[PDB]
Write a protein that binds this DNA or RNA. Structure first.
Length: 153
RNA sequence: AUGUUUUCUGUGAAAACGG
């Protein structure tokens, strides 16, 4: 037994609870684009450079952006196993985008998918129509979301 | 409290500032 704003709040709560975050549809879109920009050529960056790199290009339009918040967003992708991490003896690990995820379509999918797996981990039944609200600020992506939900289940 | 930030090699940890 759960209402719309009961589910949203709980979703964002479980998300924050894993050191992840969603900055609203527009800002999250731009972030992910910058991650690609950074890593589509196969560049390998440490987590810190990566965050900065994004934070810097993003600050102009979204003055809220911080090493912290973007850090979270990166952690979301980290958890969704998009990065091909590479250890270094007592140094920052290096991070690359797995080949499969070097397109936006591909990345944004795996990103969305992860948010859902959290919802699932959290026992939260949300319908495509609402997902498309939550993640894109509109109803233009039910089909997309439905596909994500089905391809997990 | 709700948040916000900071550090870090994090399917994550540890803190600080609001009040």
């Amino acid at each position: 037994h759960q209402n719309p704003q009961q589910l949203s709040s709980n979703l964002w709560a479980a998300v924050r609870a894993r050191g992840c975050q969603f900055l609203g549809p527009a800002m999250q879109e731009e972030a992910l684009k910058l991650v690609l920009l950074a890593l589509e050529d196969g560049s390998a960056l440490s987590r810190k450079v990566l965050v900065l790199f994004v934070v810097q290009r993003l600050e102009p339009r979204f003055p809220q952006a911080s090493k912290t918040s973007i850090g979270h967003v990166v952690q979301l992708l980290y958890r969704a196993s998009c990065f091909k991490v590479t250890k270094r003896d007592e140094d920052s690990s290096l991070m690359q985008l797995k080949e499969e995820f070097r397109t936006y379509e591909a990345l944004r999918r795996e990103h969305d998918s992860q948010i859902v797996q959290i919802a699932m981990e959290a026992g939260l039944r949300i319908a495509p129509d609402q997902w498309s609200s939550l993640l894109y600020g509109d109803q233009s992506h039910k089909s997309h979301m439905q596909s994500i939900i089905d391809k997990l289940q």
